[PDB]
Paper text:
Nevertheless, YpHddC uses guanosine 5′-triphosphate (GTP) for catalysis rather than cytidine 5′-triphosphate (CTP) and uridine 5′-triphosphate (UTP). YpHddC is structurally and functionally related to GalU.
The extra densities were well matched with one magnesium, one GMPPN, and two citrate molecules. Ala8, Gly9, and Gly10 experience an induced-fit conformational change when they interact with GMPPN in the crystal structure. In detail, an oxyanion hole-like conformation was induced by the three rearranged backbone nitrogen atoms. It means that the binding of the base portion of GTP follows a lock-and-key mechanism contrast to the triphosphate portion requiring an induced-fit docking. The stabilized citrate molecule plays as a tridentate ligand and seizes a six-coordinated magnesium ion.
Residue numbers in the entry: 1 to 225
């Protein structure tokens, strides 16, 4: 099983009328932080090394895990004094990774993915994204892929009916990004438009929630009792 980088350094929730102070991955989900439930699932999947890539309120998150760590996997921390963006965060985490490939997950997402099958599907690529097929994709960003599942573009939310959720979970070869010329950048907005290698989606019907979406918060609290 690959090393996992969890991106958890962004600000609190930002909705049209509501702004949060707590980091989104630390929202309480029926007695445990959302992040803890993600980490527990990863440990169940065989993950032995988790890197938490932090910035906003990094000391709050670390202090929480020092006191109550839900897993026995190794847990490393990397603190960004100034937010490096999602892409800069990944580039920065490459320092810690000795292997040629690793997993990136957004800390505000919880997906009951089969990571062994995801790794197998990624063997012939340097970048693979997890796409989640749902009957109603309206509240999610989605993926525009062709009939070989090559990713053509990322689509903004606001689309009724079926679609493939842009999960933000990737398997990548660190060589594609470790030496990206900028230290601060967005993975989706700066890196992906430039990347010229093979980029396909692993598409499954896995359970998916994004804790930044209010309806998914209620779904999560109900799911975990
Ligand atoms: N370490 C780090 N993480 C970040 C940064 N920006 C965002 N993140 C994290 O990366 C994930 C995705 O962030 P973002 O794409 O901005 O959020 P979204 N999917 O648009 O709501 C979140 O879990 C967030 O905490 C950053 O500058 N540094
Ligand atoms: Mg969000």
């Amino acid at each position: 099983m690959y090393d996992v980088v969890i991106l958890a350094g962004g600000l609190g929730t930002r909705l049209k009328s509501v702004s949060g102070d707590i980091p989104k991955p630390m929202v309480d989900i029926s007695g445990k932080p959302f992040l803890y439930r993600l980490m527990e699932y990863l440990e169940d999947q065989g993950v032995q090394r988790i890197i938490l890539s932090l910035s906003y309120k990094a000391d709050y998150i670390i202090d929480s895990v020092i006191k109550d760590n839900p897993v026995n996997s190794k847990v490393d921390f990397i603190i960004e004094n100034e937010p490096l963006g999602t892409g800069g965060a990944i580039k920065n985490a490459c320092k810690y990774i000795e292997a040629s490939k690793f997993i990136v997950i957004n800390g505000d997402t919880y997906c009951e993915l089969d990571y062994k099958k995801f790794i197998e599907s990624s063997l012939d690529s340097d970048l693979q994204i997890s796409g989640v097929e749902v009957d109603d994709v309206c509240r999610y960003g989605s993926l525009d892929i062709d009939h070989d599942f090559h990713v053509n573009s990322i689509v903004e939310k606001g689309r009724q009916g079926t679609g493939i959720i842009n999960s933000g979970t990737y398997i990548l070869s660190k060589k594609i990004i470790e030496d990206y010329p900028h230290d601060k950048f967005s993975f989706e907005l700066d890196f992906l438009p430039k990347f010229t290698g093979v980029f396909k989606a692993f598409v499954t019907k896995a359970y998916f929630i994004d804790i930044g979406i209010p309806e998914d918060y209620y779904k999560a609290c109900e799911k975990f009792k």
